[PDB]
């Protein structure tokens with residue numbers, strides 16, 4: 001059960017698509033999950049950073065984790081992002097998530113409302129007993145680097161599957177040398193993480209677009225060449241904060257509606273044209289969907305604040 | 308009125324005290340507010356960072372604002388923290404906060420779920436029309452520095468009261484030379500901010516403990532001696548992230564119960580022993596409360612995760 005998570009090499013942090021009024025577009029979401037499955041993704045993160053979980057009510061969130069489990073749980077591992085900057089919120093979400101059948105939880109350290117190292121331990125130890133758990137470190141978002149010390153302290157739990165690491169390949173290695181399963185959370189770094197730094201795989205953004213190529217990158221030996229060729233795409237996705245790019249790109253491919261929940265807004269026209277070129281360089285047949293890529297007009301995009 | 312907010316020199320980011328089970332201690336809260344009033348604080352932030360708004364549910368938060376307004380609104384300015392990383396949350400909370408009678412809103416940029424500069428503008432422009440607003444920049448917590456460009460863009464709203472700035476004094480001056488009201492959000496920098504860098508005042512943590520001395524620091528001219536005197540307290544208070552220090556200090560003074568909402572945990576015995584001596588050197592009479600400062604035993608502290 002923890003071992004079943006520990007073996008996953010490709011996890012997609014799935015985007016969450018919306019209807020024109022802001023509510024979840026379940027029909028679109030299901031088609032994305034399907035496409036991920038068809039191309040070899042072994043797990044999904046539901047409502048991750050990429051999934052705009054930060055923009056969900058707990059409501060929506062648990063419902064989505066549950067829908068995903070009920071429709072797709074036999075085919076793919078479901079990792080609910082039930083983390084919080086608040087311990088109470090995390091305990092309660094995690095327990096509801098596991099109750100609706102999720103396979104694991106993703107847990108970030110408390111963002112914004114930063115705690116002490118002792119506090120991190122208390123926080124993690126309060127949810128770790130609930131099930132298989134992946135700890136999320138991303139200091140550029142949270143304002144706090146989880147030190148390896150904390151990680152080893154909590155790794156005394158049998159329920160810890162591993163870390164989602166964003167600090168770099170060098171940290172990934174501090175961990176993988178010391179009996180700790182790591183997935184890279186940086187797409188631009190993940191090839192080398194896997195083949196040179198001991199990472200088990202990726203929890204990927206880029207997977208939402210090119211799941212087959214992402215799997216290729218991780219399953220079949222070193223391939224710096226394939227790595228180099230997807231890199232222009234990766235750079236585009238991260239120019240602005242994720243998931244601004246992915247949301248824009250999924251709309252251009254026609255697999256989601258051009259609807260954004262604020263505070264996210266689409267990439268400008270110049271970027272979108274650029275996307276079309278990036279797509280043709282790589283080959284459209286490698287991206288999700290069947291439809292011809294569009295540039296889209298600014299007026300196509302809907303921004304929702306009240307939903 | 309925004310001009311009423313712009314003239315405030317001393318704002319306290321008031322702490323939120325708890326009952327043994329984790330619920331708000333309103334009796335202790337009212338008493339902290341009164342203490343502030345008696346020493347001449349001109350405004351409070353209800354559920355700011357220091358107030359652990361991050362650990363509140365929305366019903367709690369709004370209730371606390373509405374309560375503060377009802378009980379103390381004629382005698383102190385009430386600024387609700389109705390900020391959020393989610394635009395939706397911010398819209399609903401802000402409108403509800405203004406409807407119950409708050410004087411201004413405190414708005415942070417979206418933490419953790421980072422957006423673009425264009426997203427930033429859209430986010431702030433959703434709430435700005437609602438009433439007087441203080442914008443909150445603390446990139447050490449949020450992962451993102453609000454660039455002055457953004458602030459100038461939003462400053463087209465007449466409802467912009469000013470900025471709570473935590474980046475430093477140089478940034479402040481950049482705003483103050485350019486027609487923008489600023490309050491320093493750092494206590495170790497607030498004296499010099501006000502007298503040398505054009506800051507209108509402080510939004511203070513330390514005023515929770517020593518309100519009179521902070522008023523003196525900001526009202527009665529340059530005083531390098533008093534500033535040097537409070538400085539050991541200010542250092543102690545920020546050694547671990549705020550408000551771990553404050554929480555433990557107020558409990559040592561006996562004005563709150565030694566109850567923590569997770570993920571915060573108290574400072575350890577040696578640091579508590581050290582607070583006792585800092586109190587001695589400044590004089591307990593400048594501190595809030597009437598009780599003898601205690602060290603407290605570890606067994607005294609109550610950590611709550613489900614509340």
Ligand SMILES: N[C@@H](CCCC[NH3+])C(=O)O
Nearest residue numbers: 053054056057058061393
């Ligand atoms: N916007 C809040 C609540 C999100 C809760 C659902 N995941 C936060 O990021 O903490």
Ligand SMILES: N[C@@H](CCCC[NH3+])C(=O)O
Nearest residue numbers: 086360361363364365368
């Ligand atoms: N922990 C959540 C909920 C905040 C509740 C209202 N102050 C957040 O920081 O966004």
